[PDB]
Design a protein around this nucleic acid. Structure first.
Ligand SMILES: [Zn+2]
Lengths: 251, 121, 56, 68, 233
RNA sequence: GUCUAAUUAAAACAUAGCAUUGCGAUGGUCAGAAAGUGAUGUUGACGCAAUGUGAUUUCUGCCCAGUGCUCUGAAUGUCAAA
RNA sequence: UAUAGUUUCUUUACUUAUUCAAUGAAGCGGAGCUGGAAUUCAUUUUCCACGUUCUAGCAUUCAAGGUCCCAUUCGGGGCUGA
């Protein structure tokens, strides 16, 4: 037949994310000496919208202890931080908002965000708007912490793995509608070329595995094996059930 | 035998001695004669009635010139050949592909005078 | 424009104060006060710490 | 001489000694560049067997190529 | 004095800037250096078989020094004195028709691996020296057993550079004596007594004993931590 | 709002909204002859990917036997090479 | 159910091989001072720290000091400060 849309999105000529209006990555400072033997102060100098993201960012400033300079960082802002603010980050720091205490140090019932997955990845977990991670419990002997992720997922990760305290900002965003293809246009044109989405069942069978027919109908069932291939994986993939769910996520 | 101190975590290439050449044979065996001299930079004057007006009025000279030249070489060359302090020099490339140099002299000189000194008017 | 800044002399470019043509004068005031105040605070903190832990 | 002893010992490819050295040298060559100048050969017996007479103008280059 | 004042700075974590401490341990070296060091490491870390590491048992420097003294006595001739010997003998065999025998016999040392190995195969040799520091160990690992089989004494000495300098080379990796004068033959005899006592009397058990397997500082420390906290009564 | 430039501008596509599916990075989807290669990703579940339906309001019934997708393995079924 | 050999499923251990990721390859590990607790059952048994938190300041010149030298002179160098 013919190559299809995802099967082109891999190559990524026109599907590369757009970058002109981003401040670079938002990341946690390196776990160098202080954050694993003590703490360090930094000044939230400003807060800024990053384009394509939904959360805002925090232009924070630390001082390289080895050299007379001011090393700048871009963090994600949690709700409650502000400008001209003293953010203390490390192991011997304090349990307030903005701080970067280790998960080994924090207690159960705690809220964190921008959590690492392995110490020295510098921000993986719960980086999007209004998403938080909750602590569950520790196994300090063989130092591990159980955490509940916004998918409900109970993961286990190390204890030196840092993570910012607070809830990520910009919450409530998807509580609002859009009402307008134009609003969605602007959204996805600053993110990446991912819109409009057109239906394969309206395409021709060369162009999709649903296309064609004198009636717009799929014909062959859309639940696709995980061990299918690149060209067949249009539809609901590795699915266990379909249809309207009535009840509970049950976890 | 003890170690050495190190203040940086970097290793960089040592600054060894950068030798200079000791050739066993000169390359091309001849110092090439000056490719560009007055007699090459100035091909000839220009004849047209417009040029005649410019020499008559502006105390200007109009030479056809090698396209490998420039105003520095031209000024030097005119000084060499004709013993004429040139004030300013302006140049173009004519679309028959050749350099044209207008040359404004100084009030100590008369371009018409030196043009008939050359022989042409 | 910047190259014109490079033309002009110093009088046209900054002010006779410490932090002449970099920071607002009121900000100069503010940060001077901040320095003096918190270094005094540091001192009294240091001495109360020293004396209480000397007792202890 | 020595070379007869060397060649026979090279035939004994699976002894503890030779496989230990195999291990060491393969680590060496793997952490080195993919084509690198060797100034003296690993197997001088075999090199002399093939034509490497030790003098000025004979060069060894060690190289790795992917298998399969 | 009264103007000067003791400032001292707080070089703590967040207080102040750090000074130019020494960081040679934390250096990004080049890769030949890394290869050197990590290679030596892996060689000790792997359970070496026994013929290797019945290497690794170099001589005490005293005995080594006396052996080197003796061999310096029995050193060969440099090309200059060789040439002048040749001029002498040329004139001598041109005038008297000597059969290249007016020049005396040499008594000196015999560098060369093929040479030395044939000398052992014929058992002409009284002593052999073997350098620990050879890059292809295959050149020499058999020599202990060979010298043991032909029954002659061998010394795993330290420094192919030293032997090369002994015999006017860069490196030689090996040397040997076959014919000594009586001026120091008894010195050689008690010497080889020490040598066989140190090598050919322990050949069997070192040939049994697998060496290496030595760990790093950190790993050793954690192992003995485990040890003390496990056997703690 | 967009399309069959040069016979079809429409009821077609899109759309917002609804719903479903996969994925916790040792990953999901996709790419590449390979590769110390790559797009999503300067990203991290209010996210990326794949589908269907098509504003709002109201409402979404019964069938899992078939075909698919998926979860069991407690099993004398079948059961390749080595 | 008990045997001398023979095979195979499982659990975990070692780092060096392999693999992942950072980093301008900076504070690794061990031991140790200096303090707190420890009950020391004899001397420490081990554990904790082992310079920073009201404030949108500032922190740089092989560090000042102290200390030992030099050739004192304009100054120069080493230990500690760490
Ligand atoms: Zn201001």
């Amino acid at each position: 037949g013919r190559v299809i849309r995802n099967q082109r999105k891999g190559a990524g000529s026109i599907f590369t994310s757009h970058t002109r209006l981003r401040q670079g990555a938002a990341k946690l400072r390196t776990l160098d000496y202080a954050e694993r033997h003590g703490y360090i102060r930094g000044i939230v100098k400003q807060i800024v919208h990053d384009s394509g993201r939904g959360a805002p960012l925090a232009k924070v400033v630390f001082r390289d202890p080895y050299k007379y300079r001011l090393r700048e960082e871009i963090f994600i802002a949690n709700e409650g931080v502000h400008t001209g603010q003293f953010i203390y980050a490390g192991k011997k720091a304090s349990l307030n908002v903005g701080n970067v205490l280790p998960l080994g140090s924090v207690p159960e019932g705690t809220i964190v965000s921008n959590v690492e997955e392995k110490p020295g990845d510098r921000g993986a977990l719960a980086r999007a708007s209004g998403n938080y991670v909750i602590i569950i419990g520790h196994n300090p002997d063989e130092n591990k912490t159980r955490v509940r992720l916004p998918s409900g997922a109970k993961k286990v990760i190390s204890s030196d793995a840092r993570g910012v305290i607070g809830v990520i900002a910009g919450g409530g965003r998807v509580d609002k509608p859009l009402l307008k293809a134009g609003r969605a246009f602007h959204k996805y044109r600053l993110k990446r070329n991912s819109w409009p989405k057109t239906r394969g069942v309206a395409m021709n069978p060369v162009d999709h595995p649903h296309g064609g027919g004198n009636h717009q109908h799929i014909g062959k069932a859309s639940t696709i094996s995980r061990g299918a291939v690149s060209g067949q994986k249009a539809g609901l993939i590795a699915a266990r059930r379909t249809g309207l769910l009535r009840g509970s996520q049950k976890t | 035998k003890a170690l050495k101190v190190r203040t940086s975590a970097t290793f960089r290439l040592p600054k060894t001695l950068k030798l200079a050449r000791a050739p066993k044979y000169a390359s091309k065996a001849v110092p090439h004669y000056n490719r560009l001299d007055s007699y090459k930079v100035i091909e000839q004057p220009i004849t047209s009635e417009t040029a005649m007006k410019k020499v008559e009025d502006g105390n200007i000279l109009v030479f056809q010139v090698s396209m490998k030249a420039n105003k520095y070489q031209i000024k030097k060359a005119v000084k060499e050949l004709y013993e004429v302090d040139v004030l300013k020099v302006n140049t173009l490339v004519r679309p028959n592909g050749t350099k044209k140099a207008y040359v404004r002299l100084t009030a100590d000189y008369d371009a018409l005078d030196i043009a008939n000194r050359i022989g042409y008017i | 424009r910047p190259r014109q800044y490079a033309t002009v002399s110093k009088t046209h470019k900054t002010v006779s104060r410490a932090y002449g043509g970099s920071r607002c004068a009121n900000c100069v005031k503010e940060r001077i006060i901040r320095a003096f105040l918190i270094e005094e605070q540091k001192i009294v903190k240091k001495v109360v710490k020293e004396q209480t832990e000397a007792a202890k | 001489g020595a070379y007869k002893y060397l060649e026979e010992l090279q035939r004994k490819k699976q002894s503890d000694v030779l496989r230990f050295l195999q291990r060491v040298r393969v680590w060496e060559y793997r952490q080195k560049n993919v084509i690198h100048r060797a100034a003296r050969p690993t197997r001088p017996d075999k090199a002399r067997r093939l034509g490497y007479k030790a003098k000025q103008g004979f060069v060894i280059y060690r190289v790795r190529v992917r298998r399969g | 004095n009264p103007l000067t004042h003791s400032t001292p700075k707080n070089f703590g974590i967040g207080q102040a800037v750090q000074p130019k401490r020494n960081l040679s341990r934390y250096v990004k070296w080049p890769e030949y250096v890394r290869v050197q060091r990590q290679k030596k490491i892996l060689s000790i870390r792997l359970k070496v078989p026994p013929t290797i590491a019945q290497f690794q048992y170099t001589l005490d420097r005293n005995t080594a020094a006396e052996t080197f003294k003796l061999f310096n006595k029995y050193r060969p001739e440099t090309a200059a004195e060789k040439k002048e010997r040749l001029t002498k003998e040329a004139a001598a065999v041109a005038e008297g028709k000597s059969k290249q025998d007016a020049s005396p016999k040499p008594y000196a040392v015999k560098y060369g691996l093929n040479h030395v190995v044939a000398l052992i195969e014929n058992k002409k040799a009284k002593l052999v020296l073997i350098a620990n520091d050879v890059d292809p160990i295959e050149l020499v690992v058999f020599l202990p057993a060979l010298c043991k089989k032909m029954g002659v004494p061998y010394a795993i000495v330290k420094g192919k550079a030293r032997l090369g300098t002994l015999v006017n080379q860069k490196t030689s990796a090996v040397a040997a004596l076959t014919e000594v004068r009586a001026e120091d033959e008894a010195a050689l005899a008690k010497l080889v007594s020490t040598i066989d006592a140190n090598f050919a009397d322990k050949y069997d058990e070192v040939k049994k004993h697998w060496g290496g397997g030595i760990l790093g500082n950190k790993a050793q420390a954690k192992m003995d931590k485990r040890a003390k906290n496990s056997d703690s009564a």
